[PDB]
Amino acid sequence: EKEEEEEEEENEEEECAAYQCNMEGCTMSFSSEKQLMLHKRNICPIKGCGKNFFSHKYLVQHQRVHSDDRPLKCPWKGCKMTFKWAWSRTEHIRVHTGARPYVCAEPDCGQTFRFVSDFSRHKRKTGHSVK
Amino acid sequence: EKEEEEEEEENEEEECAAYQCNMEGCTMSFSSEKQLMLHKRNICPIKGCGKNFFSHKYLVQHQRVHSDDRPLKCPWKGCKMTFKWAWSRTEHIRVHTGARPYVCAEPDCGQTFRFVSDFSRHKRKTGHSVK
DNA sequence: CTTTCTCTGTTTTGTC
DNA sequence: GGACAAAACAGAGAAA
DNA sequence: CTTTCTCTGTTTTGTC
DNA sequence: GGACAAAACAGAGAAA
Ligand SMILES: [Zn+2]
Ligand SMILES: [Zn+2]
Ligand SMILES: [Zn+2]
Ligand SMILES: [Zn+2]
Ligand SMILES: [Zn+2]
Ligand SMILES: [Zn+2]
Ligand SMILES: [Zn+2]
Ligand SMILES: [Zn+2]
């Protein structure tokens, strides 16, 4: 009874693998009943992933980590950098412009930061600009 | 009512965050009720991960991807390579030895392979040594 | 340990 | 209040 | 598209 | 048959 697939039928009810999803405008189809069952409950079925997600709409957006293509480009002349995610692009451009948009509001401290993660870390460590 | 933490008490029942796990010999403690609740049901609570797992015992072994340390070493003289996982080390050593342990059993084909993933792919594409 | 920078799951903001 | 999509955050974490 | 090689969640194997 | 840990697999996927 144990085999590679669920194409040969068991004594159950109307089987032939599975395909399409719905979930209010989900236009994507897994190639298995187990895969679409996971997709339906906000889990990435791709082998090796298996991540839970809060939003079903993001589960579709998540799939780009599994694709090898990088649509977003850096617009600076000699710069070949590419991205899958908009935020990476936004912060990367600062490397060219030199900008340091984040400014600690705590009055003693006057530190500026280029990237938000450095800014979040400064506040988490010092307690500046917090509460 | 919405805040950073669950240290200030609500009107519920015996609260003060959470800590230790059990699950038959799980000697690891999350620093939150939400984190340990996820751990208990085979989900990695670390932020950005959120992967489901089949075995609870592996959930502990999984945590090494989040640590930056690489205990396993390559024993060849000038080779600085290091690993977190035993299988990576085993297959990597073949680069030095030259070995090609995988041999297609299909009679016409006589192809050898160094790494198991190349061997699995050959069989999946050709249907050699399958069924 | 540091600094610099990218990745990505969730939260916040902006427009209707 | 509600969509819903765009942007931003807040970590994780790779590289030097 | 290719080849070469590493990562890691699950399965298989080996020892008791 | 059952532990349980060690090894191996089977993809994914990064690099050239
Ligand atoms: Zn869907
Ligand atoms: Zn995924
Ligand atoms: Zn650039
Ligand atoms: Zn400050
Ligand atoms: Zn546990
Ligand atoms: Zn994890
Ligand atoms: Zn080596
Ligand atoms: Zn073959």
Residue numbers in the entry:
A (entry chain A), B (entry chain A): 1225 to 1355
Question: What did the publication describing this PDB structure actually write?
Answer:
Relative of Early Flowing 6 is a DNA-sequence-specific H3K27me3/2 demethylase that contains four zinc finger (ZnF) domains and targets several thousand genes in Arabidopsis thaliana. REF6 and ELF6 share a high sequence similarity comprising an N-terminal Jumonji N (JmjN) domain, a JmjC domain, and tandem zinc finger (ZnF) domains in the C-terminus. The ZnFs of REF6 are found to bind CTCTGYTY (where Y is C or T) DNA motifs directly and recognize specific nucleosomes. Here, we determined crystal structures of the ZnF domains and REF6-DNA complex, revealing a unique REF6-family-specific half-cross-braced ZnF (RCZ) domain and two C2H2-type ZnFs.
